[PDB]
């Protein structure tokens, strides 16, 4: 058994972390007090779920997680929330004033003064691990902390844990659920400095989650709770292989091996299905072929883009529930004859498939209906370069007039870091085009 340490940075990372660990507890049968009746080894064990939970002598199952935010209002929801008893106080780290949506403030001004503390707390979790695999880092692109402090943390993690994999769950900025205008700056600044330090990153576009919540869950104006509960399902689907018995994606190193042939191109596209409203009278349970076909509909993707006009480099199908391999292949063949699936010529046109029999778990009293089978597709497509183009264009519009630049310079950042980070994103866009277009 090899441990995974989860790190949640900023409001988005913390609240998504809160929603994931709630889901993990419900999936592994862990009560809010930390007790786990089905765990017959008390205060010890090397089970699959122990990759994410440690155990006290009193039988408490403690998440291998650290929560970091430069202001306390969001983490206090954890300290006093339903699962307050799961965490030791040292695992929840809060400053007193945030980065004000200013990457420079989160990375340099405030990051410089809190980084060593965070490393020390993370070190204490590493010292409980006999074979640490690596870290899962949750954060937003747009936040001053999620963007600025994360990139500093990622640089220091590469120094202190060189041989350890690092995976990201990144929230891509969407105007429909944001009141900030500088997020394009923070996104590009953080991607540039984090690029060489992240082995695999799953971007989630709030625009996509928002539309899925309005369309499939009939939520007129989704909140962050609605968004985070949905996002935690996808995250759970991705991390399930590390927490349950299985043979596919059994350690973080396997995510790069199966999804990232080229290191810089490490942003797989995530697709989830089905998302059924709980208020529905009673939906017809979808079949393996149907939910599989849904994985190639743009409306079920975590990042809105058109994969029909890109190239696939890898592809993982992760099924949870009543699914047998016979039904998967039947659905696959059917889809290859109808869909536009263009693979890169230097990659086999195949799909790695994983099936977990335990069906998707849902938070009682949530918006998501209990389904008998669900799938999450992880595919590395050049089509996701659309998201970089969109974001890079917004950066260009504001940077041509130096709008808001003074806020970053005032915090000690040099203006040259803007163009340096932008030119790196231009090279990243060129990499995708060299792999995708003919």
């Amino acid at each position: 058994m090899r441990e995974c340490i989860s790190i949640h940075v900023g409001q988005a990372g913390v609240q998504i972390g809160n929603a994931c660990w709630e889901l993990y507890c419900l999936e592994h049968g862990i009560q809010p007090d930390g007790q786990m009746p089905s765990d017959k080894t008390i205060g010890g064990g090397d089970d699959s779920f122990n990759t994410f939970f440690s155990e006290t002598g009193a039988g408490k199952h403690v998440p291998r997680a650290v929560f970091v935010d430069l202001e306390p209002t969001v983490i206090d929801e954890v300290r006093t929330g339903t699962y307050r008893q799961l965490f030791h106080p040292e695992q929840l780290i809060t400053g007193k004033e945030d980065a004000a949506n200013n990457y420079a403030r989160g990375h340099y001004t405030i990051g410089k003064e809190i980084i060593d503390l965070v490393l020390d707390r993370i070190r204490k979790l590493a010292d409980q691990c006999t074979g640490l695999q690596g870290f899962l880092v949750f954060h937003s692109f747009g936040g001053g902390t999620g963007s600025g402090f994360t990139s500093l943390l990622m640089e220091r993690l590469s120094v202190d844990y060189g041989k350890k994999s690092k995976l990201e769950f990144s929230i891509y900025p969407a105007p429909q659920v944001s009141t900030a205008v500088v997020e394009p700056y923070n996104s590009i600044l953080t991607t540039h400095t984090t690029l060489e330090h992240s082995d695999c990153a799953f971007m989630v576009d709030n625009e996509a989650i928002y539309d899925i919540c309005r369309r499939n869950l009939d939520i007129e104006r989704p909140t962050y709770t609605n968004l985070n509960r949905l996002i935690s399902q996808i995250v759970s689907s991705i991390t399930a292989s590390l927490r349950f018995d299985g043979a596919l994606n059994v350690d973080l190193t396997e995510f790069q091996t199966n999804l990232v042939p080229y290191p810089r191109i490490h942003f797989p596209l995530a697709t989830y299905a089905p998302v059924i409203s709980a208020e529905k009278a009673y939906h017809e349970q979808l079949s393996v072929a149907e939910i599989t076909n849904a994985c190639f509909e743009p409306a079920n993707q975590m990042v809105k883009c058109d994969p029909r006009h890109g190239k696939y480099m890898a592809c993982c199908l992760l099924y949870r529930g009543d699914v047998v391999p016979k039904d998967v292949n039947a659905a696959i063949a059917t889809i290859k004859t109808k869909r536009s699936i263009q693979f890169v010529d230097w990659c086999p046109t195949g799909f790695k498939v994983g099936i977990n029999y335990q069906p998707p778990t849902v938070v009682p009293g949530g918006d998501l209906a209990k389904v008998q089978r669900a799938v999450c597709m992880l595919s590395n497509t050049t089509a996701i370069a659309e998201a970089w183009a969109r974001l890079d264009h917004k950066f260009d519009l504001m940077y041509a007039k130096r709008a808001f630049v003074h806020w970053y310079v005032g915090e000690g950042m040099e203006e040259g870091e803007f163009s340096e980070a932008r030119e790196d994103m231009a090279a990243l866009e060129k990499d995708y085009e060299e792999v995708g277009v003919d």
Binding site: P175, Q176, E207, D211, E297, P298, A299, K304, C305, D306, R308, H309, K338, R339, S340, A385, E386, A389, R390, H393
Partner: protein, 349 residues
């Protein structure tokens, strides 16, 4: 009040569409860089589709289908017809063609060429590329290949129709231009009005050197031909006159003898690529106007020559056709405050 942007100042068609939108007093034009728009009249090349459909609350529509180039590129079309199960097997309406680079079909072309030479058959081919105004018609294979190596872009060699239907008097070639509009729902609308672009020179099958009587392009006829505008004004014959001619000469009608095949060819091409370009379940909507170019041989069989993705229109038809665009393509998505000019080629989606 709907907003639209213009990003192709050279579109004669959408210059009039934009002129009509502003006339309704309910459409407002914005700077070409303003992202807050409902309709985009986009550029022909490198249209940034990836930035469409991400403005909150804005229903965004564009006048191009992403991926239609597969149909409107010479070499792309040839590959599509050969590699598409919906077409290659029974595509009896597309002249034998081969993609030739200066993968490549050099050897396969020669195999079919030697077959024709050995079998006394008419072995005349025409080489062309998308980078042309650069066309060559020849019955010798050596010239066709040496003409492509001197250049530097991909070319297609296809069988030259040695038995074209010749109009009388004059004994002259011609081609048929059909305008087709595909809206956001992927309905296929065929403009009731087509045009024959005629050659004002007598067709001479014993001299492929003088390309004025073989190339029916409106520019080549108005430039190198000495009988321009003799029979019809601007070497353009419209369906009313052409239909009457077919009744007097061949005792047939334009609908039966030709239009049935045109409609079938338009449906075949568009239905084939529908799954790959449809915006039905996309975050933005697409429509596009297409210019299908056909040839008619002396057996009254219709041949598809190419499909233009950025076509122009006949001077006399701009008013009616452009109004039809606004009617079915734009106002259908953005309504304002007949006897349609189009023919709906129904089909299964």
């Amino acid at each position: 009040m709907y907003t639209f942007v213009v990003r192709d100042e050279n579109s004669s068609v959408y210059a009039e569409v934009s002129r009509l939108l502003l006339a309704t007093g309910q459409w407002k034009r914005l700077r070409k860089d303003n992202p807050r728009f409902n309709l985009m009249l986009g550029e022909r090349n490198r249209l940034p589709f990836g930035r469409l459909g991400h403005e909150p609350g804005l229903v965004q529509l564009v006048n191009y289908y992403r991926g239609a180039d597969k149909l409107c590129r010479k070499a792309s079309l040839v590959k599509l017809i050969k590699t598409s199960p919906e077409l290659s097997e029974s595509c009896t309406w597309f002249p034998e063609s081969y993609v030739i680079y200066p993968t490549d079909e050099r050897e396969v072309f020669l195999a079919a060429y030697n077959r024709r030479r050995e079998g006394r058959e008419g072995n005349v081919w025409i080489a062309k590329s998308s980078a042309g105004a650069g066309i060559l018609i020849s019955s010798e294979a050596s010239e066709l290949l040496d003409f492509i190596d001197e250049q530097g872009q991909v070319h297609v060699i296809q069988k030259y129709l040695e038995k074209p239907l010749l109009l009388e008097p004059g004994h002259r070639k011609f081609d048929i231009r059909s305008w087709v509009l595909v809206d956001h729902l992927y309905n296929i609308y065929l403009y009731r009005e087509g045009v024959l672009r005629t050659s004002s020179e007598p067709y001479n099958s014993a001299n492929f050197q003088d390309k004025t009587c073989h190339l029916t392009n409106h520019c080549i006829q108005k430039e190198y031909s000495k009988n321009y505008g003799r029979y019809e004004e601007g070497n353009e014959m419209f369906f009313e006159e052409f239909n009457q001619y077919l009744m007097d000469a061949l005792n047939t009608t334009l609908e039966n003898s030709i239009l049935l095949q045109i409609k079938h060819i338009i449906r075949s091409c568009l239905m084939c690529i529908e799954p790959a370009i449809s915006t039905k379940h996309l975050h933005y909507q697409s429509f596009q106007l297409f210019g299908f170019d056909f040839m008619v041989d002396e057996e009254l069989k219709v041949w598809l020559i190419e499909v233009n993705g950025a076509p122009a229109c006949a001077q006399k038809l701009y008013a009616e056709l452009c109004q039809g665009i606004v009617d079915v393509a734009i106002s259908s998505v953005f309504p304002l405050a007949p006897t349609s000019i189009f023919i709906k080629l129904h089909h299964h989606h």
